[PDB]
Design an enzyme around this catalytic site. Structure first.
Site, PDB file in Angstrom:
ATOM      1  N   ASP A   9       3.864  -1.740  -9.253  1.00 48.66           N
ATOM      2  CA  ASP A   9       5.310  -2.040  -9.465  1.00 48.66           C
ATOM      3  C   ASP A   9       5.604  -3.521  -9.136  1.00 48.66           C
ATOM      4  O   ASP A   9       6.775  -3.937  -9.267  1.00 48.66           O
ATOM      5  CB  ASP A   9       6.176  -1.050  -8.677  1.00 48.66           C
ATOM      6  CG  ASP A   9       6.096  -1.155  -7.160  1.00 48.66           C
ATOM      7  OD1 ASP A   9       5.221  -1.884  -6.642  1.00 48.66           O
ATOM      8  OD2 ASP A   9       6.937  -0.513  -6.505  1.00 48.66           O
ATOM      9  N   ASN A  51       0.716  -3.531  -5.427  1.00 51.13           N
ATOM     10  CA  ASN A  51       1.055  -2.242  -6.096  1.00 51.13           C
ATOM     11  C   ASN A  51       1.346  -2.489  -7.589  1.00 51.13           C
ATOM     12  O   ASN A  51       1.805  -3.590  -7.961  1.00 51.13           O
ATOM     13  CB  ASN A  51       2.229  -1.546  -5.388  1.00 51.13           C
ATOM     14  CG  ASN A  51       1.995  -1.250  -3.922  1.00 51.13           C
ATOM     15  OD1 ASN A  51       2.831  -1.572  -3.080  1.00 51.13           O
ATOM     16  ND2 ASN A  51       0.858  -0.648  -3.610  1.00 51.13           N
ATOM     17  N   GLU A  58      -5.807   3.079   5.146  1.00 49.77           N
ATOM     18  CA  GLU A  58      -4.856   2.096   4.558  1.00 49.77           C
ATOM     19  C   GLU A  58      -5.506   0.707   4.573  1.00 49.77           C
ATOM     20  O   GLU A  58      -5.379  -0.046   3.568  1.00 49.77           O
ATOM     21  CB  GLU A  58      -3.534   2.112   5.330  1.00 49.77           C
ATOM     22  CG  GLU A  58      -2.666   3.333   5.056  1.00 49.77           C
ATOM     23  CD  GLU A  58      -2.193   3.525   3.619  1.00 49.77           C
ATOM     24  OE1 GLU A  58      -2.401   2.613   2.785  1.00 49.77           O
ATOM     25  OE2 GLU A  58      -1.620   4.591   3.333  1.00 49.77           O
ATOM     26  N   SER A  96       5.309  -4.801  -6.092  1.00 47.37           N
ATOM     27  CA  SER A  96       5.453  -4.862  -4.626  1.00 47.37           C
ATOM     28  C   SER A  96       4.050  -5.081  -4.039  1.00 47.37           C
ATOM     29  O   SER A  96       3.080  -4.942  -4.778  1.00 47.37           O
ATOM     30  CB  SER A  96       6.134  -3.632  -4.085  1.00 47.37           C
ATOM     31  OG  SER A  96       5.305  -2.513  -4.311  1.00 47.37           O
ATOM     32  N   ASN A 140       5.003  -1.494   2.590  1.00 55.26           N
ATOM     33  CA  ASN A 140       5.353  -1.877   1.206  1.00 55.26           C
ATOM     34  C   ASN A 140       6.571  -2.813   1.248  1.00 55.26           C
ATOM     35  O   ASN A 140       7.584  -2.459   1.890  1.00 55.26           O
ATOM     36  CB  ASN A 140       5.623  -0.606   0.387  1.00 55.26           C
ATOM     37  CG  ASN A 140       5.721  -0.821  -1.108  1.00 55.26           C
ATOM     38  OD1 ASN A 140       5.898  -1.933  -1.572  1.00 55.26           O
ATOM     39  ND2 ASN A 140       5.617   0.254  -1.877  1.00 55.26           N
ATOM     40  N   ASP A 174       1.590  -4.304  -0.284  1.00 55.82           N
ATOM     41  CA  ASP A 174       1.359  -3.527   0.963  1.00 55.82           C
ATOM     42  C   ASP A 174       0.707  -4.479   1.971  1.00 55.82           C
ATOM     43  O   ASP A 174      -0.289  -5.178   1.615  1.00 55.82           O
ATOM     44  CB  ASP A 174       0.517  -2.289   0.669  1.00 55.82           C
ATOM     45  CG  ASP A 174       1.250  -1.108   0.031  1.00 55.82           C
ATOM     46  OD1 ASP A 174       2.469  -1.202  -0.253  1.00 55.82           O
ATOM     47  OD2 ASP A 174       0.585  -0.087  -0.171  1.00 55.82           O
TER      48      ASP A 174
END
Ligand code: NA
EC number: 3.2.1.17
Length: 129
Positions: free
Chosen positions: A48, A46, A35, A50, A59, A52
């Site tokens: 969308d 991301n 990650e 959003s 998220n 991380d």
């Protein structure tokens, strides 16, 4: 902070992540590796809109507030910036909520794609825990 592998393993164990929701410590260390590469300051946008945040790439769509994720939630009740701290308390606390949401560690696509079913114990090998 860029954690050492065993350093992060010791920290995760201290904060009760070892075998949390039945996931061995090696599972959590493996997810952190793929990650964030063990970097508490890791942020990734991301598709969308959003973002991380931190060692476990939590998220903003569901878990923390960053003020720029329209129609999101803050289920961990924390600013996403709290998740970039050198102290992983907030990240761990929030990861406990995520992994309890019903799909276990499949919530972390990198864990599903890169850790699940693998020899995750290798990640804690040589560590004094
Ligand atoms: Na949010």
């Amino acid at each position: 902070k860029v954690f050492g592998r065993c350093e992060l393993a010791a920290a995760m164990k201290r904060h009760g992540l070892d075998n949390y929701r039945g996931y061995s410590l090696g599972n959590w260390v493996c997810a952190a590796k793929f990650e964030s590469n063990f970097n508490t300051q890791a942020t990734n946008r991301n598709t969308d809109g959003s973002t991380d945040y931190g060692i476990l790439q939590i998220n903003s769509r569901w878990w923390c507030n960053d003020g720029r994720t329209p129609g999101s939630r803050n289920l961990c009740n924390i600013p996403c910036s709290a998740l970039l701290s050198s102290d992983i308390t907030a990240s761990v606390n929030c990861a406990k909520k995520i992994v309890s949401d019903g799909n276990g560690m499949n919530a972390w696509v990198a864990w599903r794609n890169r850790c699940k079913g693998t020899d995750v114990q290798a990640w804690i090998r040589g560590c004094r825990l």
